[PDB]
Amino acid sequence: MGYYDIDDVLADGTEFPCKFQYDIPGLGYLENNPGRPITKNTKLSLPLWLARILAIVGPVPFVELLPPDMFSTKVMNAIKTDPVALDLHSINSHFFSLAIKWIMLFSEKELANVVSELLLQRAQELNHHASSLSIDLNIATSTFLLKLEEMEKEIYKKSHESYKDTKRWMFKK
Amino acid sequence: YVSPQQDFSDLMKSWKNERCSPELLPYPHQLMKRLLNRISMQSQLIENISMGFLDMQNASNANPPMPNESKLPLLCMETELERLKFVIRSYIRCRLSKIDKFSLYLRQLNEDENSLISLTDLLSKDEIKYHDTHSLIWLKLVNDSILKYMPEELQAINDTEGSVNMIDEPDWNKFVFIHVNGPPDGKWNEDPLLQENEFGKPCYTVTIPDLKEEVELTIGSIYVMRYEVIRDLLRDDKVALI
Amino acid sequence: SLPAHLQQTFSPEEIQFIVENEPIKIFPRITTRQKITRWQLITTDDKALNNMVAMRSTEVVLWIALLLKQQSKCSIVAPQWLTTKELDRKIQYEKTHPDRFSELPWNWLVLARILFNKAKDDFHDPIHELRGKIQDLREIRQIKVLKGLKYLNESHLQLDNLSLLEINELRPFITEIMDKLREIHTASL
Amino acid sequence: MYGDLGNKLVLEAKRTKQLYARSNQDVNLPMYHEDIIRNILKEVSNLRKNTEYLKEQQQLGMLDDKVAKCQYFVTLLCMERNKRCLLAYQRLRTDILDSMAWNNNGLDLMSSITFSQQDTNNLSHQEQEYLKEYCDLITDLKSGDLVDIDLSGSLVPPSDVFIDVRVLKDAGEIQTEYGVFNLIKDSQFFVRQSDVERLIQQGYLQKI
Amino acid sequence: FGSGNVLPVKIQPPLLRPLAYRVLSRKYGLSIKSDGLSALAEFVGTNIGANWRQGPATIKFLEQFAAVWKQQERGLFIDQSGVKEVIQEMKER
């Protein structure tokens, strides 16, 4: 609920599938069809700042939210099998924010049990890669930091900076 | 009171609590006044000795202040004043930043009739002037830039009924590091909250209602805990933010 | 305050400040006893500094001791835990109990670094041996911290004897991970 | 659709934040985005016209109410989204300006001598005005009850009484309390830290 | 800024620079140059009679000298123009 947060604003503009449950004229720029009015039982991808509200006001609301592609059974199975190796960036750049949003709109205890485990298992690798300060006298870090969500990069940067400052102060001669 | 060491201890504990806390802590009105008066007198004192040493030197080409038992005391005065001024400066600027972050929330608190929290206690007078001036300047900027081209239905910078709440409030469940000091002064039997445990020193008890559990904090241990369940202990100096 | 992060975490220099705001023992090389200019400090008790006699043990705040040792008017005595015997006892205690932290003072790393930098002559043991022992302790403490990081949740954690610098270098990761876990749990209620 | 342009603006803000985040030294804000902002202004004006038209077309009673409610909600939501994007961009730029204003020891910034961190023409006119009143607010703070403490002073703790400094730029003799410093270029000084904090902050001295 | 005192006693700037430094360099403004400091000796010596132990007079003089430098853009270093700005100050009154 951060009004001025940039990342929340960006993540809140993603497109979700949905179906119109009524028949209404005057629309159509949603379909990029200006003059054509929208019919009943039409499936379109609408942005989240619109689909969230259109599914509340009606009783039956005007629009029904359809299951997303990023929360399918395949993605859950891939998360469960191997959390660290999975490329969450390819799935979506804002996986976690949309995950808590989806849990909030629709109370789903199963998703809350999977996302928590995924985050907990990826935190260990994040700490391992953040603590590795190079000494002057690997492919793993470059490979892993390309699989990081938008939220996880902030934590990586903070941890890395703190470790470097601590090491710098310890060995200042 | 009437101890200059305890004033410095209290200032340090207030600064340490201020940096790590999410909310805007109450202002220690008396302590700041005493410290500012002490600084004002001390600066005059060092100035007085400096002038006295300088004036006599030029009169009859006399010797400078004889080096033994002379330089080190005054050097210590200067460095001690420098450290104290730094501590107070950091405290003030940190609380000013926190004031900047929560302008609308403070305004709503002040505008509410049935609110025990009042800005005359939580905010210093200079901080009140800062808040009032900054709010007006920011409102002028946003009104001239964007809000003028908007429908009358939505022209308010504070809207609690819109799609997203425009008033941000402090995070009341932030995770913090705490140390259990125990009683502020002593008399462990006097404190009613203290309760003994098995083969151990007395431990405080708190409850987490969302989790619905009871957590015991033993004295002398460091904990990572929610901020809300520990507000009373921190207010009563039983725990200290590290 | 605002610039260069500093919003919710202390810098190493501020930790050093807090450490130097703590007392230490010295052997004065000068006598400033009153006869039968004075210090008159405002944040620390000046009774010991005013009444000083040579070749006797007194205690003052740390930064005054460093300022005096900058001149030739002081000699700081290192704490008793800065010895090879007392460090080897703690190493053994650290080895035997793999699920608790040893009881070291909350400023051992900062104090060790400061004393090695400033008062190198005052130590009785060779300094390289102590410097090796400090690293030996730090590595094992790091192993225990790495093992303990696995038990992160939404309720609370207990880190009984972790040092100040160790807490500072780990705070941003721990706090944010538990905060995100707490939001995920709260959302499902 | 309607708000798809404003997202671009938000994206730009993100990039600026990175320059703010990855900043070893102070940086300058990029160019203003008055053209994109004017485009959102035009589209929100068109949305206002559409809302008006819906108002008349409903109040003549040719259309069902349930039908009109949907487009009313859509227009309202699009305007709210555009307002959110514009306000977020403005607040980020305002925060960076406040940080710079604090990090120049108060003063009037662009009118007087500046540290050359920022060009005049990057900022908008309203931003230029805002900066002026914010600097005046800092100034009359510094003359408040906290005169003895320099609220615009250094924020790194003092831990070294005597320091070695080197002059970067040539200058003349400067009087200090109880003495004089002669700023001959390529010369080294061994002096107390308190005397030279001001000169180090203004770029006439190096090292600490 | 006033006249009619006993006579303009001459004193060295060494006994004048601490007050000017504390008022200007520390709080607001800076760079009191040596030549500028010598220039600022004459006008304060014009009314020198029974001063350096007095109350507001010197502080108000330094305040008024700061007023020009807030008003005019000027610069940092104080040069032989220091009398030129006091001419402007007496023009103002």
Numbering used by the authors:
A (entry chain J): 1 to 58, 68 to 146, 159 to 194
B (entry chain K): 53 to 294
C (entry chain P): 2 to 37, 48 to 200
D (entry chain O): 1 to 208
E (entry chain M): 2 to 94
Paper excerpt:
Both C2 symmetry and asymmetric refinement yielded a structure with limited resolution. However, symmetry expansion approaches revealed that the two rings in the dimer are identical. By overlaying two copies of the CMGE monomer to the lower-resolution dimer, we can therefore obtain a high-resolution view of the entire dCMGE assembly. While in the double hexamer the tight homo-dimerization interface is formed by the packing between six MCM zinc-finger domains (ZnFs; degenerate in Mcm3), the transition to dCMGE involves the loss of several trans-ring interactions and a one-subunit register shift for the remaining tethering elements. The residual inter-ring contacts involve the Mcm6 ZnF that transitions from an Mcm6–Mcm6–2 to a Mcm6–Mcm4–6 interaction. As a result, the two CMG particles in the dCMGE complex become splayed open, pivoting around Mcm6 and creating a large cavity that exposes 1.5 turns of duplex DNA. The intervening DNA appears to stabilize the dCMGE dimer interface. In fact, when CMGE–SCFDia2 is superposed to our dCMGE structure, an extensive steric clash can be identified between the E3 ligase engaged to one ring and the Mcm3 subunit from the opposed ring in the CMG dimer.
Our results explain how ATP binding nucleates origin DNA melting by the CMG and maintains replisome stability at initiation.
